[PDB]
Amino acid sequence: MVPHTLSTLKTADNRPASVYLKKDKPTLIKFWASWCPLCLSELGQTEKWAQDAKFSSANLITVASPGFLHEKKDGDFQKWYAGLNYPKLPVVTDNGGTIAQSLNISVYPSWALIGKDGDVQRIVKGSINEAQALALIRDPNADL
């Protein structure tokens, strides 16, 4: 998954995912689903988490796969979500979810770490807490 493709991605705001990749800084992806309530409710927490200084250090964004994983189709989803959360939350939509399929995820929620180079560094399956994020930004080796 070249960084040219990942950066090529686009958000629900028809914005370039590249804007969320640069400064040789780390990037964190979070997969969610509309049919997923816990996720929807997490958005709010993820939106503020993206505003957390601790998190600021790294890039925080979400990824969604339209028509993938029984998830709303493209266009219909962005429109649905367009009426959810605020215009201050990072949302990335990958048709078919090349990254989700590349990592053979197809499971949400999910977290993905992308080295400062823009390559897959570490993949996480499940959910994490604000604290975990800290430990993540502190060290990936961190594990109970």
Curated annotation (Swiss-Prot):
GO biological process, one term: protein modification process
MF-aspect GO terms: L-methionine-(S)-S-oxide reductase activity; peptide-methionine (R)-S-oxide reductase activity; peptide-methionine (S)-S-oxide reductase activity
Domain topic, free-text comment: Possesses 2 methionine sulfoxide reductase domains (A/MsrA and B/MsrB) and 1 N-terminal thioredoxin domain.
Portion of the parent chain present: 34 to 176 of 522
Keyword entries, A-Z: Disulfide bond, Electron transport, Multifunctional enzyme, Oxidoreductase, Redox-active center, Transport
Function according to Swiss-Prot or TrEMBL: Has an important function as a repair enzyme for proteins that have been inactivated by oxidation. Catalyzes the reversible oxidation-reduction of methionine sulfoxide in proteins to methionine.
Additional detail: The domain MsrB is stereospecific for the R isomer of the sulfoxide of MetSO whereas the domain MsrA is stereospecific for the S isomer.
UniProt superkingdom: Bacteria
All residue ranges annotated as the Thioredoxin domain in the record: 2-142
GO CC, any one term: cytoplasm
UniProt keyword Electron transport present: yes
Species of provenance: Neisseria meningitidis serogroup A / serotype 4A (strain DSM 15465 / Z2491)
Full protein name: Peptide methionine sulfoxide reductase MsrA/MsrB
S-S bonds: C36-C39
Family: In the N-terminal section; belongs to the thioredoxin family. In the central section; belongs to the MsrA Met sulfoxide reductase family.
